[PDB]
Design an enzyme around this catalytic site. Structure first.
Site: not given
Ligand SMILES: O=C1NS(=O)(=O)c2ccccc21
Ligand SMILES: [Zn+2]
Ligand SMILES: O=C1NS(=O)(=O)c2ccccc21
Length: 257
Positions: A103, A195
């Site tokens: 990402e 994200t």
């Molecule tokens: O899919 C995800 N990427 S993240 O680390 O930003 C996050 C934080 C909390 C819940 C889900 C997720």
């Molecule tokens: Zn994530």
């Protein structure tokens, strides 16, 4: 419902979640030449010795390993952070090919995958309250490149056959997340967001400079997971990453020279 497909993917998310076009969205490209060394940053404190993993779950967008967060057992402190952040879960984002999947990017370079260790600020009492605060979460991001195997990842990859489809979970006790860390804790940090929907702007991002290496066999097993539920048309769980978002009025700080 949102996903990573052609008509429900990241370019569509803003319709249900307007904050997708907000002022501190993640991920971002990390321009290494523009990131500034911040001598006032402290070393990260990663204290995972007493971690209690519980379950592993396919939630239809990734798989997550969940931890007991009812006590200070596995915590992140120091670095850019004020106070104590409890480890709740980790998960990955990955690609259909080795040249994409992360990402965050580094000078526009995409890695094969990205590990997110998600922590919440204990001063807010529970994770639901924390996601409503600008300093509610800290996510430790670690890049994966394909090369040598990561021994500490193998226990994860070997249970994935038991959670192939959305909604499946399995016992996953006594897993040590220290086995997923690289040697160096050198990092970049910036204020950002979840994200995935709801894309809440509650995250202090801490992205490690050193990637971990995983083997081609290990990442291939990621790519055998399914987005779909059991008894539905098979859609491989691949390319579950959000692309880099506008940096806007933010500076990325480096812990190292
Ligand atoms: O899919 C995800 N990427 S993240 O680390 O930003 C996050 C934080 C909390 C819940 C889900 C997720
Ligand atoms: Zn994530
Ligand atoms: O994330 C997704 N949810 S879905 O099963 O509709 C799908 C199909 C194709 C590509 C991605 C996705």
């Amino acid at each position: 419902h949102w996903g990573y497909g052609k008509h429900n993917g990241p370019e569509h998310w803003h319709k249900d979640f307007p904050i997708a076009k907000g002022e501190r969205q993640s991920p971002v490209d990390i321009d290494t030449h523009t990131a500034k060394y911040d001598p006032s940053l402290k070393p990260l404190s990663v204290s995972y010795d007493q971690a209690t993993s519980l379950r592993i779950l396919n939630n239809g967008h990734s798989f997550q390993v969940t931890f007991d967060d009812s006590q200070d057992k596995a915590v992140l402190k120091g670095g850019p952070l004020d106070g104590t952040y409890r480890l709740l879960q980790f998960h990955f984002h990955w690609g259909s090919l080795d040249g994409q999947g992360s990402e965050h990017t580094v000078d526009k370079k995409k890695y094969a995958a990205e590990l997110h260790l998600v922590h919440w600020n204990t001063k807010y009492g529970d994770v639901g309250k924390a996601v409503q605060q600008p300093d509610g979460l800290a996510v430790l991001g670690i890049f994966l490149k394909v090369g040598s195997a990561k021994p500490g990842l193998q226990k994860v990859v070997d249970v994935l056959d038991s959670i192939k489809t959305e909604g499946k979970s399995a016992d996953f006790t006594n897993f040590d997340p220290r086995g997923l860390l690289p040697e160096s804790l050198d990092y970049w940090t910036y204020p950002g967001s979840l994200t995935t929907p709801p894309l809440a702007e509650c995250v202090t991002w801490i992205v490690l400079k050193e990637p971990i290496s995983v083997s081609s066999e290990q990442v291939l097993k990621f790519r055998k997971l399914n987005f779909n539920g059991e008894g539905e048309p098979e859609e491989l769980m691949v390319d579950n990453w959000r692309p880099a978002q506008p940096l806007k009025n933010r500076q990325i700080k480096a812990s190292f020279k």
